[PDB]
Ligand SMILES: Nc1ncnc2c1ncn2[C@@H]1O[C@H](COP(=O)(O)OP(=O)(O)O)[C@@H](O)[C@H]1O
Ligand SMILES: [Cl-]
Ligand SMILES: [Cl-]
């Protein structure tokens with residue numbers, strides 16, 4: 001006490017605490033309200049969060065991310081087998097269970113997905129503690145509505161290992177609805193749609209709420225669609241640009257590409273607020289600096305297809321919920337990618353002008369709700 005709410009995301013995590021009737025989204029040591037769900041291993045240390053992602057470009061093999069794509073799954077799992085091909089780190093099989101293998105202090109080591117995630121939760125726990133100036137023990141941790149028992153169990157174990165007493169595992173969409181106070185009894189049932197576009201996944205959930213009780217009507221989306229795909233479209237655009245101006249292709253330089261990706265991710269965030277953004281990278285390739293810029297319009301074209309496609313899962317969710325657009329009482333934005341103006345237009349146009357619940361930072365909405373629920377449970 002106080003107990004906190006932690007959003008353990010695929011790419012970013014967020015922790016909040018509810019005090020004096022208000023939720024405080026807690027900033028980390030670097031002043032960031034969300035922290036990368038990254039962990040890195042080196043000859044001398046173990047890095048978590050910002051410190052880990054900041055060195056991902058020079059240490060691709062021992063920097064782990066996406067642990068949430070493995071958590072609660074078996075090695076033989078089809079999705080595990082597919083994802084493994086795309087990760088720079090190794091995933092091994094231990095008695096039918098996946099484990100990430102890395103080099104730490106010169107020796108080989110493997111960790112279960114819940115162990116990597118416990119490291120991320122420990123970081124969030126310490127972040128809350130630095131702010132509260134007290135020890136944090138109780139917490140509510142979130143999971144996608146589609147997680148099964150094994151995944152929920154593994155996420156809870158990750159918390160226990162982090163030294164947290166998990167009060168409860170709740171679904172992200174429900175946490176988001178709770179953040180907006182949509183769980184208050186108000187007569188009859190209400191249909192709420194959660195549009196969650198994160199950095200690596202896209203989830204659309206339709207909930208029916210009556211008497212403070214939630215009913216997941218349907219879920220839709222794409223487990224391999226997120227802000228990270230928008231960054232790639234930008235990376236390819238600039239690889240071509242650098243090639244035209246310099247007669248050089250930086251494609252095979254893993255570090256140069258990762259550093260360009262990082263500059264694009266940052267330019268992207270700026271484009272949600274401004275109509276243009278500057279990209280300036282020192283010594284990108286062979287000592288050549290890359291100073292350029294990109295417009296919001298340009299950014300939207302490079303991603304027009306991906307953006308527009310987010311509406312397919314929305315139509316399917318409605319169909320599976322046996323509901324029509326007009327029957328949705330509230331539309332909630334979750335995920336940092338929903339801060340993109342063009343995406344808000346697409347969703348809004350689809351719902352014929354209906355206003356979107358977007359006052360709470362989408363990438364903080366889940367942690368916000370979990371923080372509210374954690375206080376209640378305490
Ligand atoms: N202002 C912004 N505009 C566009 N994208 C953003 C903005 N802020 C954060 N993002 C993106 O949101 C994604 C992940 O954050 P969320 O907070 O969505 O994480 P997670 O993937 O774990 O759910 C990233 O792709 C990140 O670049
Ligand atoms: Cl930190
Ligand atoms: Cl449009």
Ligand SMILES: [K+]
Pocket residue numbers: 007008009010011012013014363
């Ligand atoms: K998150």
Ligand SMILES: [Mg+2]
Pocket residue numbers: 009010198335
């Ligand atoms: Mg998320």
